[PDB]
Design goal:
The structure is a homodimer. Chain A is of the alpha/beta class. Chain A contains 10 helices and 13 strands. The first copy, chain A, has 2 domains: 146 residues, Periplasmic binding protein-like II (D-Maltodextrin-Binding Protein, domain 2); 109 residues, D-Maltodextrin-Binding Protein, domain 2, CATH 3.40.190.10. Helices cover 36% and strands 18% of the residues of chain A. A 4-stranded mixed β-sheet of chain A has the order 9-10-8-11. In chain A, helix 1 packs across helix 9. The longest helix of chain A has 14 residues. Bound molecules: the ligand CCN(Cc1cc(=O)n2nc(C)sc2n1)c1ccccc1, glutamic acid (2 copies), cacodylate ion (CAC) and zinc ion (4 copies). The site of one glutamic acid has 10 residues of chain B, from helix 5 and strand 10. Chains A, B: This is Glutamate receptor 2.
Amino acid sequence: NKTVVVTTILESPYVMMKKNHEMLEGNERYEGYCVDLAAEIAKHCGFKYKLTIVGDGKYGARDADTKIWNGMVGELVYGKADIAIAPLTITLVREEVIDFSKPFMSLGISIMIKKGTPIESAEDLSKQTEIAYGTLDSGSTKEFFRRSKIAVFDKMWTYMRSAEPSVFVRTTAEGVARVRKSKGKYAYLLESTMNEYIEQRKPCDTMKVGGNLDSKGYGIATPKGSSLGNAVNLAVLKLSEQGLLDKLKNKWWYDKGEC
Amino acid sequence: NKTVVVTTILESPYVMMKKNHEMLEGNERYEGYCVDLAAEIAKHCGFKYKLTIVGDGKYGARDADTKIWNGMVGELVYGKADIAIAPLTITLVREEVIDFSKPFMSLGISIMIKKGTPIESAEDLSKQTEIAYGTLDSGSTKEFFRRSKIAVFDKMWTYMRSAEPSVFVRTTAEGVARVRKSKGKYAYLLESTMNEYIEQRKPCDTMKVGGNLDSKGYGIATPKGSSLGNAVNLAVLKLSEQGLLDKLKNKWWYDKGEC
Ligand SMILES: CCN(Cc1cc(=O)n2nc(C)sc2n1)c1ccccc1
Ligand SMILES: N[C@@H](CCC(=O)O)C(=O)O
Ligand SMILES: N[C@@H](CCC(=O)O)C(=O)O
Ligand SMILES: C[As](C)(=O)[O-]
Ligand SMILES: [Zn+2]
Ligand SMILES: [Zn+2]
Ligand SMILES: [Zn+2]
Ligand SMILES: [Zn+2]
């Protein structure tokens, strides 16, 4: 019986450093939605675990011409972690190389603007040029636009992939800072979950506008054919049905919202 | 190469008899979201199929005494069908005996009222007796209330399980008709998908009120360990990422709206 290595990512409010983390040890250094969820999954499946932050700070993408997976997906694919408990989006290209539980949280790509920005939709972004816009790198949102055959989204991708300087950012935090610092001249495309969270945080100067561009979910991921997969899947469904996932969302998004 | 037997259920707008069904044969008798979905799934997985309407007209529940499954779930469990393509809710007790694809559509339990009924929430229903309320039999909504430790819902189940005359119905259509003819003295608990569909159909006298009580999804189901399960799962994700599922939702819900 071995300690399960959990890969996750510093992404608020999923996993964050506790204020006093320096004086704490192991799993106690972290807090957030996925820290709470990991404890519950492990309890219900009966395993001990170690939270580890993914080394390259990425979600997971396959390099073209190198074909190596980076991020949390890479940690699973190459045997460095036993399970990923993170806001990791269920996508076809990932499900081909790793296993996902049923989803524990729903989301869709969405638009973040600085308040007052003259934008209400993706169509709006696509039909103008004054306001720049981009996505996270090495994630499922970038891939959505890269692959889309829908005219509005193809138009946005054609713009974003060629825009200079780059409209892509390394972390969600970078995208949010760029929105806040650009006086309305930058909009950020990110998952509704993260958008909704930031909307509840000081300085309360951003907001989600328009509907979501797609509809999908986060899943708990394991290496393909892992024996952990079945129990983890059943645990997600149990925690869903018992209302835990709704409680955790309220706790980390809304209960202590600052706006 | 064998023709795949698909079990499904007559439930609008998922599977409906075409107006001219009496002169049509086989799969062409039927239309709707799940008829379209079946055709897409079959094309991407490369099989031929026959749509069959579930014999007992039920989704699926286990008899507490005999432990025998009925409905579509039973047809899969006992080898009568190869796959279920229907608004079949992903649940823990079901996933223990059959396999589900990743979800193709989201839903939550919701309240249907006759327009003008003084009800805004589940909490409202629980705190009164003038307006009776019930659910579908042999489905996931009934099981939700039976197994709910949440205060308001637990209170609701105690009322419903002992209600006389019975507040439970055999079909969604029976529930809706009961709302429409009870002059506001019956409210129906049903999935948001079906609620939102009915609200857009003549005679436009019903309404979805309040938020959803939970958050979950429908999946394509296969018997445990079936060879079809893998391909079906990937096909759902492909259709999701293509925007096809969104297209079908708009086609059958809102393009066909008449209120
Ligand atoms: C997260 C709660 N859901 C809803 C949900 C999640 C999700 O990824 N997608 N993708 C779609 C395409 S429709 C949808 N609905 C859920 C949870 C467990 C089992 C099924 C659903
Ligand atoms: N959740 C995304 C990362 C965030 C984004 O791409 O917007 C993923 O799994 O790649
Ligand atoms: N979709 C439900 C049936 C409808 C309901 O229970 O409200 C099921 O799979 O059981
Ligand atoms: C397994 As428990 C009810 O202590 O989270
Ligand atoms: Zn620190
Ligand atoms: Zn628990
Ligand atoms: Zn197709
Ligand atoms: Zn009770």
